[PDB]
Every structure is written in C-alpha cells, then in structure tokens.
Design a protein around this ligand. Structure first.
Ligand SMILES: CO[C@H]1[C@@H](O)[C@H](O)[C@H](OC[C@@]23C[C@@H]4[C@H](C)CC[C@H]4[C@@]4(C=O)C[C@@H]2CC(C(C)C)[C@@]34C(=O)O)O[C@@H]1C
Ligand SMILES: Nc1nc2c(ncn2[C@@H]2O[C@H](COP(=O)(O)OP(=O)(O)O)[C@@H](O)[C@H]2O)c(=O)[nH]1
Length: 814
C-alpha cells in the first residue's frame, strides 16, 4: 500500500521499472499465477471503477542480487506493471496493441501439454514487438501427484518444453537483439505450481550450501545445475555421469535440490510422523503453535512456504532478466517513428528526452463509467504531457503536409491509469505510461499526439485470416436500428479481423475469419456492442442478368392506355465493351461524338448506333445500353426521358429474379404514340418501355478468386477439392510456399475451409473475394439446371412465385 507520492517517486526511477505481461494458452494457469503475484507484491493506494487493465507490483532485491542485474539500476526497489492482454489469439491487432506497451513477457507453459499453438501465437507476436521472454513451466504438481512421473522423465519433459520454446524464439527474434533464447542455468526458466506459495532459484540453494560445502556460491550454483555430479564415494565433483567402475551417478541438481523437496512431499503426504520432525529439523524448518498439529497437504503447504517462500521465483526473473525505457527507446526509436531517422523527434525518442516536443503514442481507448466517455491510454515517448496542454492529435491517416486527421485541442486532464481507477496528475515525462481524458471524439483506437508541426506519426507478430464467413444482421425491433449501427462500429474497432459493410440489397453484413470467429462476434455484437435483439440470416452471392444472343423476334408491348407501343430487340454487349464501360474507357458523360468514334473504330460498333446511345444503365452508368434505331417517330424527343427512366428501372431489376442486368444492349426499332401528349405521359410510356425491355430480354436467350497458400506436396488436395465444387484453377505461382488462385462459386463455399484442410492435411490457407463475371450456360428458367437452381433458391428466399414469368407475359400481340 503506497501513497500517490510514493508511487510518483517510484515512477521517477524508470531504470527500476518493468513493463510486462503474462502469455499463456487457456487453462495453463495465467490467472492463478497473477493472483499469486498480486497477493505477494500487489500495490494498493494508501467511486469510479474501471475494467482492470493493468496491475502494479512492488519488489525489493538484496544488494547482492541487484549487482547481478545486467542493466542500469538505481537502488533496490522495483515497480512492475503487469499489463493485461486479451484472450483472443488469432494474431489479432488488439493483442499486438497490448504487447506494444510492454517490454518483457512471462510465458506460461504447461508441464504436460507443453507449448501449444495459442502459446506460440502470442509469443510470436510478442517477439515481433521485440519483447524479451522468460518462461515458467506450470502445473508441475500434476506430474508428481497424478502421473507419478520419475525424476529423469520430468527432467526430459522440462528440457523438451524449453527446446520447443527456443525454436520459436530463434525463428522470430530479431538478430539485432542477440540471443534472446531461454536457459534454465541462466535463471530465465522457473518451474512450479501456480495453484499450490513456494519457488526457488539455484542461487538461493547455492547460498544455502556454499557456507556448508566450504565453497563460494559462484562455484556452487554452477555445480547445482546441468552435468555436475558429486560422487559421495570419492567426495569429488565431476562432469561425468558415471564413476571409474562405470556405475550411474546422480546429477547434483537432483541430489541436493530435488531430493530434499521430494523427501518432504513423500514424508508429509504419507503421514510418516516419525520421519517428518527429523527432516524438518535437518532443513532447519520450524513449526510454531497450531502448525505443529497440521498433517497432509495443509502441513505441506505450510512447510514449503517456510522452506522456500512462487511469487519469489517469478519476481526474480522479472527484475533480473526482463528489460526496463531509456535503454529500450535507444534501439526502438526508428521502428516506432515513421519520420526521418535523423529527425528532431526521432532523436528525442532515442534519448527519451522529456524536454523535447511531445511524442505521445495512443495505444487504445479504454471504457470508463463516465457516461459513454473513453479515455486514451498510451505512452509518452518524448517531451512531457500536461493537463490543459495544447497538443496536435494526429489520426492513422495524418501527414505533416495535409490537414487530414489533424485535430488541435487542449488535453483536459492527465490521469494515472491504476487498475480500474484513475488519478489526475499535472504532468508526465517521457518514458511513462499514462491516460488522457478529453481525446475521445478525435481519436478512436491508435493515434499520435505531438507538440511539433513537423512531427511525423508512429507503428505491429505463426488459421484463416480472410473474412470468408458472412451473415446479414438486423434488429428485431425497428426502433433499435441506431444501436445496431453503433454496435457494428464498436465491434469493428475492437476486432481487427472482423468486417461489416452494407450490401447491394441494403443489409448490414458482418463477416468473420471462420464460423467460430463470426459466432463470437455476433454474440458480442448482440449482447454488448449493440445490446439489442438481433436477427441473423443468410453471405448471399450477387448475380447478373444478361442475354446470349439477339431477340429471336421483335418484342412488342403496349402502354396501360393501349394507345402506345414500343418495338424492340435485345442483344449481347461484348465483354470487352462492358469492361471498357465499367473501367473508364467508354463513359456516360463523354462527348457522344468522340465516344462513338472509339466504339466504332476500336470496338466494331456501327458509328451511327454509337452516336445514338440514349443512356447507360443502371444508375445512368452501368454496362447496358439503349440505342435509338427509329426512323420517323414524330414525338420521339418527348418520350426520351420516359424511355431512359424505364431502362434505369429495367436494368436495375432484371426479369429473371430481380438481379441487375449486365452486357445487355437494347435497340428501339419503332414507336407508335398517341397524337395527344396526355396520353403518352411517363405513367404510360415508362411501363411500356420496361415491359418491352423485359420481353426483348427474355426473347434473347436469357442467362445469369480464391487465393490459397500452401506447400507443394499439399497442392494436390486443392485441385481435388475444387473439382468437387465446380471450381476452376486460374494460376499456380511461387523460395516460400505456393499460391494457387482459382474461381469458386459462392454457393459452393460453405464448409470449403473445412474440406480444404482435410484434403491438404491442414496445410492450405484460403482467402476469398467476390470476383464476377462469368456466364453460366445453363437455362435460368429450368428449375433443375445449375443456373436454374440458383434462380429458384433466390425466388423462394424472396417470396416470389417459383415459375419465372416467360417472355409471352410481357408481349402484347398486335
Ligand atoms: C475486402 O473484403 C472483400 C472480400 O471479402 C470480397 O471481395 C467481398 O465480396 C463481396 C461480394 C462483392 C461483389 C460485387 C460488389 C458485385 C457482386 C458482389 C457479391 C454478390 O454476390 C459477390 C461477392 C460476395 C458477396 C456477398 C455474398 C457478401 C458480394 C456482395 O457484396 O454482395 O467483399 C469484401 C469487401
Ligand atoms: N493442477 C494444477 N492446476 C492448476 C494450476 N494453476 C491453475 N490450475 C487450474 O487450471 C484451471 C485454469 O486456471 P487459470 O488460472 O484460470 O488459467 P488461465 O485461464 O489460463 O488464466 C483452473 O481449474 C485452475 O484451478 C497448477 O499449478 N496446477
């Protein structure tokens, strides 16, 4: 329990600060270990609550210990910030953000399960942030109590776990950091049981046996680990595991450190009441009062706490091995800073200079109980931030030259982020973590605060990574729409791999990396983010409605009045031309003359037809056209707007099942109008044109990028699956892996990710994006053909009649 003054004093000696977190796979004991740390060294102040985000620990080392610290030290007191990290381990950006504010990590590994993918994933991300690791092989009690494992087996298990870990480290750690691997002999590996208050270092035992073996501890701790044997028969220390006769010698670690512990466990747990007093006496352990009566685990717990007070082992590795900002910002400056390496701000970062201009990185926005207000959490890399200070808020898109994302505003208050609470403070110099109030509106997620107009902005760690699984989300109660729209924003910000957007059909879409990911997202969206009943339903694939040939016969339709008639034919527009329209070569607003010269000279069009295009559709710019081929219609000019409008309507909603048209050309052959405009009005001609277009369309023989990375030998599975799903290979490129690109119908992609791992031995990684467009040759009007099935499914899904109205339905015989 410290006062604000004591805390602030502790925060001045950043050489004696440790910013770190605990990395662990679910159930490996991350929680019980931190409870242990908190109960042993947690710090507390001598009605606003927050979600626990970080905890402060306090530790004192002996004068000799502090001498062993291979880094700048000021005194024997240490302040340890145990920073909370998310539990989602999908290489998410929320995790990367949390690690970014730490410098070291306590990696928890299970005695039995060893290093699992989740563990490798966070560690890999950590190494990517140049974080130094230290390991704790947890749940050791399981191997002794449940599995009855033997000493050499337990040893071997420990050694294999340590090797698995140093494989990940040696693979992803920056060579510039040197050897960041972990070594039990160097004290960077702890062993124990977070559930059961005892731990040790070889050093403590060396101290204990040095003045007893008549040898200095430097010599003793080297002998208490690895291949050092003490032959009781010769009374000598050797490095050979056998004697002259070749008989097996027990390792010094086993003989002097493990055996005493093993004997204590065995004697106490088996109630050997005549063997316990002696053993305790020999180890100089003293039971006082009610303790003398304890037995079994109760006695054990109490005896081990006295003999070797877990937290102690962990704190020792944290203080002695994890890195302290002055030291680190010297080699981290350039990465952290986008600007010039010779820049005034970069230098201020390298020197962790508190008198320079401000360089404060906003790690994330944290939820507060202050009615919808989020406080900015971050770290001062340069300068010092002050309450009421005028600063420059630069979002993710800011550039020193443009005024994008820029926001000048005063910082309302600078607060210490202590667990769920805050503590207003006047200022905070470079090298410290801190919270800012009043930045809510201008920044959401990461950012960069500066006090220099020149200041440039600041920068992120081996499952699917593409949002291939998507559903439509909608409120059950219309009035809730606002909360949903807001919830999606909140959801997107908290999840890097989550995607939300509005569909062509007006539905909010939420897409996730995999079925499970999407499920968490929807649960969180509904329960928290939006907090309102949501309705989930089918991603729907969009299709286009086109024609394969010219109308088999002139289309004829009359107006409601029955006085007006339009005669037309529909024909295919060449792909190259549709593409040209879609991509900017042939444009709706270009000068009709020059455009017609291009369409005629370069695309084979008849220049008169081209000069006479009346409009593009849908939306006035789509790849469908109306060309005027009439000769002597008197009031043509007066119906043009109605005809154009009807086309925008027809091409927007095709007659097959309501999808947009594409590559459809319509030629107006003739129009017969009533002499009086009353009759001829849009309300008469718009329906006529739309009815005729649908008819010409139906009479024209109507018709309606998956990137995979993987090893060579696995590629064969890819072709195997694709062939089972109307797939089609596109490209096979490459000394990393391979990358196969192919087209995969959307209605053949449900469960694809599963069948692919199954066919590639879990070695292939898919990625999918909507691509097109390809014309299906089957009949859209035949409920049993490939195209027809798709059309029948969409029609039922929309509550339309199953049978597709045929052309005769829009044809008005003369
Ligand atoms: C960056 O992420 C990308 C990729 O996931 C992919 O390109 C995806 O495709 C979405 C679709 C896009 C197509 C174009 C807009 C026209 C046709 C559209 C589609 C309709 O069937 C095909 C894909 C899949 C879709 C339906 C089923 C949702 C599309 C849609 O948005 O409706 O879009 C997101 C934003
Ligand atoms: N046997 C054993 N179980 C442990 C140990 N530490 C934690 N556990 C158990 O493992 C489960 C998960 O522990 P927890 O601390 O919540 O792990 P986390 O979710 O990874 O942080 C709980 O049932 C614990 O009681 C340990 O050292 N030994």
């Amino acid at each position: 329990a410290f006062t604000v003054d004591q805390m602030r004093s502790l925060m001045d000696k950043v050489t004696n600060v440790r910013n770190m977190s605990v990395i662990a796979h679910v159930d490996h004991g991350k929680s019980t270990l931190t409870d242990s740390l908190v109960q042993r060294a947690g710090i507390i102040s001598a009605g606003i609550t927050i979600k626990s985000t970080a905890i402060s620990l306090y530790s004192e080392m002996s004068d000799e210990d502090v001498k062993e610290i291979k880094q700048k030290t000021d005194g024997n007191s240490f302040l340890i910030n145990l920073i909370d990290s998310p539990g989602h381990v999908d290489f998410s950006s929320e995790v990367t953000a949390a690690l970014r504010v730490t410098d070291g990590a306590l990696v928890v590994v299970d005695t039995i399960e060893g290093v699992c993918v989740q563990t490798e994933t966070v560690l890999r991300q950590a190494l990517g942030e140049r974080i130094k690791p230290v390991v704790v092989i947890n749940k050791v009690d399981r191997a002794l109590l449940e599995l009855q494992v033997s000493k050499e087996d337990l040893y071997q298990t420990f050694a294999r776990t340590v090797e698995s870990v140093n494989v990940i480290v040696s693979t992803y750690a920056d060579e510039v950091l040197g050897d960041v691997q972990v070594y039990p002999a160097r004290g960077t590996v702890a062993f124990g049981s977070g559930l059961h208050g005892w731990a040790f270092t070889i050093r403590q035992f060396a101290t204990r046996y040095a003045k007893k073996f008549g040898v200095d501890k430097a010599k003793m701790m080297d002998r208490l680990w690895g291949d050092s044997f003490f032959n009781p028969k010769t009374k000598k220390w050797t490095n050979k595991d056998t004697d002259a006769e070749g008989k097996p010698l027990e390792r010094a670690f086993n003989m002097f450190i493990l055996d005493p512990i093993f004997r204590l466990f065995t004697a106490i747990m088996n109630f050997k009441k005549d063997e316990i007093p002696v053993l305790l006496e020999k180890l100089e352990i003293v039971l006082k009062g009610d303790e003398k009566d304890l037995e079994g685990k109760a006695l054990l717990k109490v005896v081990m706490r006295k003999f070797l007070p877990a937290a102690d082992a962990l704190l020792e590795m944290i203080v002695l091995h994890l890195p302290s900002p002055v030291t680190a910002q010297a080699y981290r400056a350039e990465q952290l800073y986008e600007g010039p390496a010779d820049d005034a701000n970069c230098i201020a970062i390298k020197n962790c200079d508190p008198k320079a201009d401000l360089m404060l990185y906003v790690s994330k926005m944290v939820p507060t109980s202050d009615k919808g207000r989020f406080y900015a959490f971050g770290r001062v890399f340069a300068g010092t931030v002050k309450s009421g200070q005028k600063v420059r808020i630069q979002g993710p898109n800011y550039v020193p030259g443009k005024k994008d994302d820029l926001f000048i505003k005063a910082i309302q208050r600078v607060v210490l982020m202590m667990g769920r609470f805050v503590e207003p403070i006047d200022d905070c110099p470079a090298g410290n973590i801190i919270g800012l109030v009043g930045i809510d509106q201008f920044l959401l997620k990461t950012g960069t605060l500066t006090t220099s107009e020149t200041a440039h902005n600041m920068k992120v760690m081996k499952f699917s990574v593409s949002p291939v699984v998507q559903v439509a989300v909608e409120v059950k109660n219309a009035n809730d729409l606002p909360k949903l729209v807001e919830g999606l924003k909140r959801l997107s910000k908290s999840d890097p791999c989550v995607l939300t957007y509005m569909s062509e059909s007006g539905e909010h879409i939420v897409a996730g990396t995999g079925e499970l990911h999407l499920e968490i997202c929807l649960q969180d969206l509904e329960h928290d983010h939006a907090g309102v009943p949501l309705k989930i339903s089918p991603p729907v694939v969009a299709y286009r409605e086109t024609v394969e040939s010219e109308s088999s016969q002139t289309a004829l339709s009359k107006s409601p009045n029955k006085h007006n008639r339009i005669y037309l034919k529909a024909e295919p527009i060449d792909e190259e031309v549709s593409l040209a329209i879609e991509n900017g070569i042939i444009n709706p607003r270009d000068d009709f003359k020059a455009r017609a010269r291009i369409m005629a000279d370069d695309y084979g069009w008849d220049v008169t037809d081209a000069r006479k295009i009346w409009c593009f559709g849908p939306d006035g710019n789509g790849p469908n056209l109306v060309i005027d081929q009439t000769k002597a219609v008197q009031y043509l000019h007066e119906i043009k707007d109605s005809v154009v409008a009807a086309f925008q309507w027809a091409t927007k909603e095709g007659p097959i099942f309501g999808e947009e048209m594409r590559s459809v050309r319509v030629n107006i052959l003739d129009v017969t109008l009533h002499a009086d405009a009353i009759h001829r009005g849009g309300g008469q001609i718009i329906p006529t044109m739309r009815r005729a277009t649908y008819a010409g369309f139906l009479l024209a023989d109507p018709k309606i990028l998956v990137e995979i990375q993987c090893p060579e030998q696995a590629v064969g599975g890819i072709y195997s699956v694709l062939n089972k799903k109307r797939g089609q290979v596109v490209s096979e490129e490459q000394t990393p892996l391979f990358t196969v690109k192919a087209y995969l119908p959307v209605n053949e992609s449900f469960g694809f990710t599963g069948e692919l791992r199954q066919a590639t031995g879990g070695q292939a990684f898919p990625q999918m994006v909507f691509d097109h467009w390809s014309t299906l040759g089957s009949d859209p009007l035949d409920p049993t053909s490939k195209a027809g099935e798709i059309v029948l499914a969409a029609r039922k899904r929309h509550g339309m009649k199953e049978e597709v109205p045929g052309w005769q339905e829009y044809y008005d015989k003369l």
